[PDB]
From a paper:
The [name] 50S large ribosomal subunit is composed of 33 proteins (L-proteins), one 23S and one [name]. Here, we present a biochemical and cryo-EM based analysis of the earliest period of 50S assembly, utilizing an in vitro reconstitution system with purified rRNA and L-protein components. Taken together, early 50S assembly occurs in a domain-wise fashion, while late 50S assembly proceeds incrementally.
Late 50S assembly, apart from core-stabilizing incorporation of uL2, involves stable binding of bL9 and bL28 in state C-CP_L28, which stabilizes the base of the L1 stalk.
Numbering used by the authors:
A (entry chain V): 1 to 94
B (entry chain O): 2 to 117
C (entry chain F): 1 to 177
D (entry chain W): 13 to 81
Write the structure that this text describes.
Amino acid sequence: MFTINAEVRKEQGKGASRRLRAANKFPAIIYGGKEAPLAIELDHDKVMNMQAKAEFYSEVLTIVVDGKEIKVKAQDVQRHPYKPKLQHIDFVRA
Amino acid sequence: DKKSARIRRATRARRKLQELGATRLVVHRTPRHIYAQVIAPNGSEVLVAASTVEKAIAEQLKYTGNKDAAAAVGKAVAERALEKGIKDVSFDRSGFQYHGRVQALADAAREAGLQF
Amino acid sequence: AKLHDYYKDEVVKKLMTEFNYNSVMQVPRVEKITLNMGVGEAIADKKLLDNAAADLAAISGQKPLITKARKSVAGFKIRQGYPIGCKVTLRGERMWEFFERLITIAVPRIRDFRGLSAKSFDGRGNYSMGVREQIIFPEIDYDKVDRVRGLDITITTTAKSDEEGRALLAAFDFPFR
Amino acid sequence: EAKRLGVKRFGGESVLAGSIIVRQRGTKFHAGANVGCGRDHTLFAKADGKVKFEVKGPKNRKFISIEAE
RNA sequence: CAACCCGAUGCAAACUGCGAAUACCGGAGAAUGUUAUCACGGGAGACACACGGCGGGUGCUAACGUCCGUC
RNA sequence: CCUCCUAAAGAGUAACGGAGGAGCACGAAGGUUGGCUAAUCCUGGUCGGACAUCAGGAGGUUAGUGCAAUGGCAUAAGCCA
RNA sequence: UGCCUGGCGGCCGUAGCGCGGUGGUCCCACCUGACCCCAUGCCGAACUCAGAAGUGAAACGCCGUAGCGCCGAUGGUAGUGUGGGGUCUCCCCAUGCGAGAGUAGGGAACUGCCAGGCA
C-alpha cells in the first residue's frame, strides 16, 4: 500500500557519503539472508516525508529498485545527533 | 579435585621437556589399571604404549593393578622401546610420587637395558 | 568399627527407608569431626593454651594442631602468626569411639538441657555449634580442671543439604529442640 | 636517567644466539622455543633464525619464539 | 539529611572491556635517481639563529606572551 | 641514584615545569627437591563493641610479593618442610 | 570400524557459566585397615598398599536448552596522512586509510595420536 522509490548505488566511502548528503540525498543498506547485502541511494526530503508516518515502526517496506519489488524492514535507523537530517538507514529483507 | 592437581603438578616437567625436545616416556597410574606410553618430541605421536587392562600383558598378572603388574608393565615398555629404537628417551612420572609402583616400573625399565 | 557397624546396620536402613533413596551411598556419610578451642584469651597467657591442648589430646585420640592468626586488625591489637587456639581433626576409629562415648553419657548430663538446635546449619549440611562448660565431658576431672572453658564442635559430612543433617539427627533420635 | 624500554628486535627479523629480543622491566612476553629469560626478565635468543610473536595461554600471554633457517 | 547499593550522571597530562591514520624497525617486489648508502684517511667552517604553518605545555582558552617535535 | 607525567600509539625530547623514596638489607630474606595457596562478606560463637581466633559457604588475587613508586608474580616471583 | 569411556597436544569465553535429563558394558570415582611402600607442623590431611562390598551417588563424561555469556560482518560514524580554502578557539573541500558501539550472522565447538568396552 505504501510507495517507495529507490535508485542503484555504485560508490562507496566517506567521500561518497559526503557527496550524497550534499546532493540532498543519503545512502542506506539492505542486509540479511543468503542474498548479498547491498547499498541503495535514497533522497532526503521525500524519504523524510515517508518516515514521518507513524506506522513505519510496524510496517513492511516495499522497495522498488531496478524494476523489482522487495519486502524489507528497518530494524535500525542512523540519525544525525541534533540536526533533523538522516545520513544512513538499515533494512532487512523480512 | 585429584586429577586437576596431578595434571598441574606434572605441568612443570611437561612444559620444561618441550624446550629440550626429546622423546619422553610417561606412565599413568590408577589402582584399577596402569598405562604407559613413549611420546615423541612433537608431543602428539607415540612409538609404543601399554595398558594393564589389555590382557596381552596382564595375562600373567594376578590383577591388572599391583606392584608386580607395574614392574611387568615397565619391563614390557622398556623392552618394546629398546627393540623399536627409541635412542635414549627421557623420563616423566606423570607428576606422581616416586616411591611406589611408579618407582618399581622405573627401576624395571632401567634394568631392562635403558640409560635414563 | 564398634559404632560404624551399628550405624551401617540401622541408621542407613532407616535413612534409606524414609528418603526412598535408590543409590546405596545416597544416604549421608560422615567425613570427620572437628573439635576446636577458640577462646581468644591466649594473648593473656600461653600456658592455658598448652593445658587445653593437652586436655583435648587426652579426651581424643590425637593431639590438636594449633591455629595461627588470620588477619591483624589495629583496633583489637592482634598480630600475625601468633597462635590463639587449636583443633582436633577426628577421623577414623578415633572419631567413631569418641563420638560414641560422647553421645552415650555426655549429652544427656548437661545443665539447662533445652535441647540442641536443628536449624543452625552452615548451609550444606555441616552442623557446627559451640558449647561451654567442658566439665561436661568425663575425661576432664576435677584434678586437671583449670577454668571453665568453651569449645566448638562440628560434624563434617558428605551431605550437601540441611535435610541430610536433619535425617542424621533423627537417626541419633534428636531428644528434642 | 631514562632507562631504555621496548622491543629491540621484532618479528620476522633475523637474530643470533645471545641477542636480546625485548628488554622488559616486568614480564610482558614469555620465551618459547630457543628463547631464554634472564635474571632481569630479558628475552634472548639461543639459536640463529627468524623471530616470531604469538598469543596463547589462559590469559592470552604473549610468547616470543625463534625458528631456525 | 545521608553510606554500600540498580540505573546512571560529569571529568581523568600519569584510566582502558576495545582501539586508528600517521612516525620508527625487518623482509620481498616493478620503476627512477651521475652510488644518491657505509667504512677509512686529509681539510675545515659553525657552536646567542630569526620569522611562519602544523599539534600541544604554560598565561586569565585577553596580548606580536612564554617553551616544545616537525616542516 | 631511582619511580610517574608534561612527552604527540618506536626511543629520546625543554622550563626556577609537575609529584615521591633511598645511601638500604640477608650468612637467610639464597639455591635445590617435594608440597600448599589470598584481601572480602555471611552463618554460630562466656568474653564478641560489626571490627582477637575459631568450623562451613562464596570470593579468585582488590591480599601478599621487605623499603617510595613502577611493571610483572597463581606454574607463582607468596607460604611449609 | 558406528557408539561410550580414558590418556597424551593444539586452540584459550564458537571450547565459558546457569538450568533439565542420561551413564556403569569398559574406564573413572567412591573404603575400610594400614602396625607393612609412603607420611602427618594431629589426623591415612594428601599420596601409597586390595579390590570391588556395591553403587553411579558428591564428583566426573555426554545430550538438550541461545537463558546468561562470547565472537561478530556489510554499511555508516568519529578520527587521521597529503594540498588548499574559510568568518583560522574550529569547520569544509579532493584524495588514501579507516574506528569503537551496534545490526545481520555464528555457535551448546572443532581437531591430531593411543588405549578399554559396547558390535
